[PDB]
Design a protein around this ligand. Structure first.
Ligand SMILES: O=P(O)(O)OC[C@H]1O[C@@](CO)(OP(=O)(O)O)[C@@H](O)[C@@H]1O
Ligand SMILES: O=P(O)(O)OC[C@H]1O[C@@](CO)(OP(=O)(O)O)[C@@H](O)[C@@H]1O
Ligand SMILES: O=P(O)(O)OC[C@H]1O[C@@](CO)(OP(=O)(O)O)[C@@H](O)[C@@H]1O
Ligand SMILES: O=P(O)(O)OC[C@H]1O[C@@](CO)(OP(=O)(O)O)[C@@H](O)[C@@H]1O
Ligand SMILES: [Mg+2]
Ligand SMILES: [Mg+2]
Ligand SMILES: [Mg+2]
Ligand SMILES: [Mg+2]
Lengths: 307, 307, 307, 307
């Protein structure tokens, strides 16, 4: 009934909209499709996707700065194709899961260039709550674009048949409480006491209750998605070893914090809202705790308690 | 260069082969393709796939009894289409992961009907080491058929482009030791002491070493595959609560035990080789511990030790 | 390297462009894709395609009036989705060729609504040289969008793989003279003397020469395309029996006259340029003679001569 | 409901069947699929397809000699992969129609090697009525395999979705009389008097009647198919200039004569049944007149009359 094309544009009418967004979302989708295709019949793959997003974004004529998980230095579009947009992406998230055919995907966040000053990285270093829009594409089982703007969150399923994305749920809102905790527990020797105490509670309900089911796919987007659609909680915390956890703020953490918050979720470092943290590096990491609010809250209480 | 079609047939030449197998593998693949297709643009889905495997298998003219995770009672093909083969399948494995687009798949095992007696369930109740061939199809990221016969293990990638499966690795052999433990740890309050003691060791290496990474996707085939191609260990043990664990022997446990053993892996209940257990029910469960031999061994030592 | 998306938009930048076009071409393409898909695995089909073009065009928000070969009465979009554009289409051209899997396609022409008056058919009744843009999609062998605006003519090939159209030739220009005449000769008893005399010349070169090859596929777009890319001439003339020939002016004749003229071709009724004829009916027919200029000219000379 | 796979095999059961056929039809189909794919997103293409048919046929292990329109000399499979079958194919028929996206296809005929003598061309030089089976694949609009064995004629539609061919009509039988004559009339100066007199009758019905519609797509298979499913007549006769017409007997003429005869059609040189002509060259041409019997008969009467 409704393509992402129709949908985006119908939002642009809504906002007397720049629609510079539209071109941009449009190029983006072209990419996602290109990736879905490379992936579905396949670290070059890591690399292939990068270029694609970089190229399509350039030609969108709607972006000025690009931040890629896969690139040392931020990219500024040569002037002719310049756009008022700044885009940070994890081109395909889940290196580890590439070779064993586990779900992988693309995460992206869009900021409006606020700077009058010629576009520079500094343009990328804004807090997550400046995002104009954020989303991800998940290539597993099926492809799914999850787009989230100020309005709320909307899921579109890719139909390889007609080469379009198609609204399935819009908008989405996450269960207030869930049954699934997602964290890499090998790092158990390293976890702060709040996490630890927290994990135990999930395995040994004090109020006798069922213990949470545990899932960790290994791909952020896969885990973040399951989280979004099923409810529950997802964790990549700091350990003694990585002070700021492992997941980067620009292309991994904020988009998902955003998606999560717009869905009525929550996303904290354990000490603060992820969106509200203003970065000092285009490549900085940040502990992330997201998902059903009731659940994230429960853990925040531990953190508060332990300090 | 080589389709599964060419490949199977080139094995049939090898064995002066019945090739009743060929028709059967062939119908099977037709199915996998049908499923890949339903899944990639989608519990009816659970149900849809069932029929497909049931129908294509019937029309193969090479099977007599069918055991399906999804059916209360075993199926015996009406006589005209009868075949000397008995096939047990989990039509799509990972109900829980269906809706959130995590990798799912099909597991299957093929036994030759030994019984002179008219085909009955009893035909299905053989030990895993009577399997003629066993395999699975994994719909995530990409599709992949993993076929394993007496010869060894071979991976074919589905190419949606020409509608064929195509050899990528053949045969496969698993790393002797790995870095990844896969188990649902919510059930931690229930785990026997050997598991427990075992999990700790992975998180707190006594020989100071890196602690294993942990992954649990939620789908058996997804986990079993990652295990196969990356090395490591996968666990669904009995707890106090489920005496014989959760995974069924016919369609989930044995195929994977087989795939695993033919790949040079290992697969124990913790007390015995999974293949070597002769079932009393077409729907019985069985604790399963598989993957890199060195790893499974390490845990077997715990089990032995604790008894 | 270049999608139709990128391309269209890069023209819109060029013209400070309305880009209301872009949305429109975009919806159009969505359709073509939908049709390609229905067709490639298939008079309902005639009917299915109609709706698709009608719906996608409505939702484009860029059209006011629609003229369809398949509809008795012109369609005016309900006001909210109104656009400054008027679109006439043969939704799929070649009814006769549907069932026997011969190439079929979609022909379309876009006019800017000039009328201040509320949109009415009269909005459709303009001469072909008022077209803003015209084109067709050809579903045979491969899919191909041929888009032609004031600039010139450009061919994009559909890639079912990523669900995009991709520039292959742009712009196109037709050979000045060709080797192939295309006309349904069963109607030979009916042809005016100029056609007749003309056909003979092709079969019996007076300047001893090779006689033209003859092709008539049965689908206008198929024939018009072969004509465009190979050179030669295509004919659907009036006979005694159909005074104004068989092909309709709005959705069949003008788009192709346009495509042809922008490619440096020619398109006459035999008495006048097809574009320059101002219609009195949204469903009127008109004799059409198009293709390589040298060839069309040769026949015009006959016509002049015989009058 | 029914794949070509199931169907072929269900014929092999029927005939206690060699099923060496099955492997062969199976490899064949693999090819057709490969070609459909190359074609649908594209003289290399002429050449690409050749190899594919050559390779897949070799690996079928069911053919000894191959005759290809595209190869000067007949091919004999290196001994290990030898089969009792001889296959003559036009790998893709309609060179002229390749670049302008008009329907193209593959024509093939299968003979059982009768010769005790080591396989040599002489193995290919049999009359058309020795064909074991004959068919074609048509890539236009949609893909369609038309398989015809002693039983009768059956049409399978390729479904790019699951990568299978699927029965749509089986068997087929052609209308006794039709409304469409198909011939390249540029060659009109060359046509024998019987053709000429014949063509006129179609344009000027003596019994006042409608004159036949005329279609000539340019691709043999396209024309032959339209003919088969719609009825009518198709002609590539000898002229003064080409004594034996243009179409080759092994890979173009006989398969279609066969398909046509098994469908209840007719196929004559004008002087004799095409099947009944025993060739002296793997690359020889032969005038062909096929299609609805009543129609072909009408023309045979002319031929008889004029001699
Ligand atoms: O290996 P662990 O510690 O689980 O880290 C996994 C995380 O890293 C990410 C981020 O990049 O993938 P990967 O490192 O494999 O590229 C996420 O997809 C995932 O959530
Ligand atoms: O929910 P938990 O206890 O992890 O059980 C998951 C296991 O069950 C299986 C077996 O059926 O899936 P599911 O129950 O979701 O159908 C496996 O795919 C998976 O390994
Ligand atoms: O049947 P004839 O007289 O050849 O008319 C064919 C013409 O009609 C058209 C126009 O609609 O197709 P059809 O009538 O089969 O729908 C053109 O595609 C084609 O050029
Ligand atoms: O060019 P004309 O004389 O029509 O010959 C066309 C015939 O030749 C064939 C046979 O090869 O195609 P082509 O020559 O273009 O390769 C047939 O498909 C078609 O029927
Ligand atoms: Mg990443
Ligand atoms: Mg299951
Ligand atoms: Mg039409
Ligand atoms: Mg040919």
């Amino acid at each position: 009934i409704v393509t992402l094309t129709r949908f985006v544009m119908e939002e642009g009418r809504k906002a007397r909209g720049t629609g510079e967004m539209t071109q941009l979302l449009n190029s983006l989708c072209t990419a996602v499709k290109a990736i879905h295709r490379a992936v579905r019949k396949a670290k070059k793959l890591d690399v292939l996707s990068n270029d694609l997003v970089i190229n399509v974004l350039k030609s969108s004529f709607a972006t000025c700065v690009l931040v890629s998980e896969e690139d040392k230095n931020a990219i500024i579009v040569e002037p002719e194709k310049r756009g008022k947009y700044v885009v940070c992406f994890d081109p395909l998230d889940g290196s580890s899961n590439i070779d064993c055919l586990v779900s992988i995907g693309t995460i992206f966040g869009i900021y409006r260039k606020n700077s009058t000053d010629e576009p520079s990285e500094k343009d990328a270093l804004q807090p997550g709550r400046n995002l104009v829009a954020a989303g991800y594409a998940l290539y597993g089982s099926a492809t799914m674009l999850v787009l989230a703007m100020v309005n709320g969150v909307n899921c579109f399923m890719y139909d390889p048949a007609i080469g379009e994305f198609i609204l399935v749920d819009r908008d989405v809102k996450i269960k207030k409480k869930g049954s699934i905790y997602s964290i890499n527990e090998g790092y158990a020797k390293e976890f702060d006491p709040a996490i630890t105490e927290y994990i135990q509670r999930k395995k040994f309900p004090p109020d006798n209750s069922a213990p949470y089911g545990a899932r960790y796919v290994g791909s952020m987007v896969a885990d973040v998605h399951r989280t979004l659609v099923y409810g529950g909680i997802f964790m990549y915390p700091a350990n003694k070893k990585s002070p700021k956890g492992k997941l980067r703020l620009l292309y991994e953490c904020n988009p998902m914090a955003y998606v999560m918050e717009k869905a009525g979720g929550l996303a904290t470092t354990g000490k603060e809202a992820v969106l509200d943290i203003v970065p000092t590096d285009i490549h900085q990491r940040a502990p992330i705790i997201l998902g059903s609010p009731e659940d994230v809250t429960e853990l925040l209480e531990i953190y508060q308690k332990h300090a």
